[PDB]
């Protein structure tokens, strides 16, 4: 019988890399969603499972509201089946995904004039991320024969990277802010719908 | 709620080229999969291609692969279907039909482009 | 990829009479997250474009009076029409979105009997 807290993960002031993805689990509340057709501010926007017309008048268990900045070549990346560096590493999508994937530019906002490096994203990883799987492991990736005994060099990369955020490069090279929303529903109570 | 329009009839001859196209109007169309699906006279649906204007994402029908080319231009939210050489057996009426996700039933459809392939 | 078989091709029912249309998939299509099929059903009359009835073979697009309904579940679905109408006379089809390529059905021509 409250409104909704959407407006806190889309209007938010700071959001997280891509390998530390944020997830917001939304329950107890109503949300309209006509706010997220209307707004032309969303420079891609993916429902894959439902219909997002016709969602004010259904009802689901769990609603999942995820949360990330990758670059704009990588915006292709978070759907079902796909493959790269941010799909296998970073943010994986199950097959069977029940949800939509939104993304709009933040250049604006996530860019120094010399180049904001504080986001990062793994660029190594010797096995392919499980759906909606996240991983903080520091540790040092082993790309040669000899073992890396937690000091880095040759063979020995540190498996996370910079992205260099300059407001002057290409659109492809830009922030651009992503949600992906999830909707699942055992036979559970249901608690968040809409009007 | 928003709508789906269409070009005019089209009449060419075998082998000339044709671009027809489908525009959407109203709010809400960031979300919407425009697909293309094939009627010929008296005979079933059958379904083409489907887009999405937002990063011009396109699949194929194996039956219509490399036969038609589906583009899209987000600026005008127009989605449009060409052929390069038309044939004799392409005479048949070709709907625009629009869902808002990728595995979402067609909620809006267009009227109809009615293309008569004849010598 | 998915094959869909109407049946059957032609139906003629009286005024105010029961119209069954079944439709049989050659492979299950129901999203394992939601437990929802994804199947829908269609009317298509004469010069008109198709028109969306039914979505997830149960639920029913606004405005559809209260006389047509779906059911079914793994590969048998069923389109039932309660008080066939005069203004329902039309060609229906189901169709699957489960996975691109779409698949529609053959399709039913049901007329009125008299």
């Known amino acids: 019988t409250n409104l909704c807290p959407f407006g806190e993960v889309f209007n938010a002031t700071r959001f997280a890399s891509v390998y530390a993805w944020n997830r917001k689990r939304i329950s107890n509340c109503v949300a309209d969603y006509s706010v997220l057709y209307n707004s032309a501010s969303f420079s891609t926007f993916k429902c894959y499972g439902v219909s997002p017309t016709k969602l004010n008048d259904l009802c689901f268990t769990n609603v999942y509201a995820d949360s990330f900045v990758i670059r704009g070549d990588e915006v292709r990346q978070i759907a079902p089946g796909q493959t790269g560096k941010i799909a296998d590493y970073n943010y994986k999508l199950p097959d069977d995904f029940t949800g939509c994937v939104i993304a709009w530019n933040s250049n604006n906002l996530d860019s120094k004039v010399g180049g904001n490096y504080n986001y990062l994203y793994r660029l190594f990883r010797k096995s392919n991320l499980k759906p909606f799987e996240r991983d903080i492991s520091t540790e040092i990736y082993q790309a040669g024969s000899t073992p890396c005994n937690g000091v880095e060099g040759f063979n020995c990369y540190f498996p996370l990277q910079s992205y260099g955020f300059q407001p002057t490069n290409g659109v492809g090279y830009q922030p651009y802010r992503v949600v992906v929303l999830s909707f699942e529903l055992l036979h559970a109570p249901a608690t968040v719908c809409g009007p | 709620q928003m709508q789906l329009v269409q070009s005019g009839t089209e009449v060419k001859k075998p082998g000339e080229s044709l671009k027809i196209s489908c525009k959407g109007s109203?709010?809400?169309?960031?979300?919407?999969?425009i697909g293309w699906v094939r009627q010929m006279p008296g005979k079933g649906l059958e379904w083409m291609g489907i887009?999405?204007?937002?990063?011009?994402?396109?699949r194929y029908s194996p039956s219509f692969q490399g036969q038609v080319t589906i583009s899209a231009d987000k600026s005008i939210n127009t989605a449009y279907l060409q052929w390069s050489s038309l044939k004799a057996s392409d005479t048949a009426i070709y709907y625009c039909?629009?869902?808002?996700?990728?595995?979402?039933?067609?909620?809006?459809w267009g009227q109809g482009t009615t293309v008569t392939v004849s010598s | 990829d998915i094959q869909l078989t109407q049946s059957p091709d032609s139906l003629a029912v009286s005024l105010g009479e029961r119209a069954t249309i079944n439709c049989k998939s050659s492979?299950?299509?129901?999203?394992?997250?939601?437990?929802?099929?994804?199947l829908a059903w269609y009317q298509q009359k004469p010069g008109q474009p198709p028109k969306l009835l039914i979505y997830?073979?149960?639920t029913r697009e606004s405005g559809v009076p209260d006389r047509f309904s779906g059911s079914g579940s793994g590969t048998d679905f069923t389109l039932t029409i309660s008080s066939l109408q005069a203004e329902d006379v039309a060609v229906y089809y189901c169709?699957?979105?489960?996975?691109?390529?779409?698949?529609f059905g053959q399709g039913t021509k049901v007329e009125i009997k008299r």
């Open positions: 169709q699957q979105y489960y996975s691109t390529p779409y698949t």
């Open positions: 887009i999405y204007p937002g990063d011009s994402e396109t």
């Open positions: 039909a629009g869902g808002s996700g990728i595995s979402t039933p067609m909620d809006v």
């Open positions: 997830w073979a149960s």
């Open positions: 492979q299950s299509v129901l999203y394992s997250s939601i437990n929802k099929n994804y």
């Open positions: 109203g709010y809400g169309f960031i979300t919407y999969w």
